Amino acid sequence: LTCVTTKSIGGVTTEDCPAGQNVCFKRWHYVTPKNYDIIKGCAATCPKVDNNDPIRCCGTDKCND
Amino acid sequence: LTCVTTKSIGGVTTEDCPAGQNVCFKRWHYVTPKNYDIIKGCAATCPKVDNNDPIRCCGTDKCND
């Protein structure tokens, strides 16, 4: 699986998820009531959200664009 | 190869692994000393485990049930 990934040093690439990570996610992390950062990448499961951040989890290549 | 797969949005289906992915895995991911989530799917190799999560890797259809 290839997911769009937010570079650890900012920016965005594409990355083949390590074996066992079959979920791409796109999370709109709200830093303020109006501002958010989008985090994208590979994961083993859809990341747990308990702060109501919208999240998109999918299992197809670059589905988290 | 057809592996049991945990849906990216929760749940479980069956999926034909993409070409080059000949391993089904079932990982009991421990979130707490008593609680765990089971992750299942296709992989190119048996996923690396360094946190002692039990893992089952096999190469036959739905062997990771």
Side-chain angles (χ1 to χ4, degrees):
Chain A
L1 181 71
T2 296
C3 299
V4 178
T5 300
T6 301
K7 291 198 285 290
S8 58
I9 204 56
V12 48
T13 6
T14 264
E15 101 151 45
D16 275 35
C17 304
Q21 291 194 10
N22 289 330
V23 179
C24 293
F25 71 88
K26 179 177 181 184
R27 184 185 186 132
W28 289 263
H29 182 55
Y30 280 79
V31 298
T32 76
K34 264 206 300 311
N35 304 337
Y36 54 87
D37 236 287
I38 301 170
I39 306 160
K40 300 165 179 174
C42 295
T45 50
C46 186
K48 150 197 162 286
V49 172
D50 68 335
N51 67 164
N52 311 116
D53 275 338
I55 189 164
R56 155 77 171 174
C57 285
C58 50
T60 58
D61 289 341
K62 299 178 206 168
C63 58
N64 66 333
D65 59 297
Chain B
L1 181 71
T2 296
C3 299
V4 178
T5 300
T6 301
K7 291 198 285 290
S8 58
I9 204 56
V12 48
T13 6
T14 264
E15 101 151 45
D16 275 35
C17 304
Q21 291 194 10
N22 289 330
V23 179
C24 293
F25 71 88
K26 179 177 181 184
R27 184 185 186 132
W28 289 263
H29 182 55
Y30 280 79
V31 298
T32 76
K34 264 206 300 311
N35 304 337
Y36 54 87
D37 236 287
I38 301 170
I39 306 160
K40 300 165 179 174
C42 295
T45 50
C46 186
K48 150 197 162 286
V49 172
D50 68 335
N51 67 164
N52 311 116
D53 275 338
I55 189 164
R56 155 77 171 174
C57 285
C58 50
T60 58
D61 289 341
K62 299 178 206 168
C63 58
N64 66 333
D65 59 297

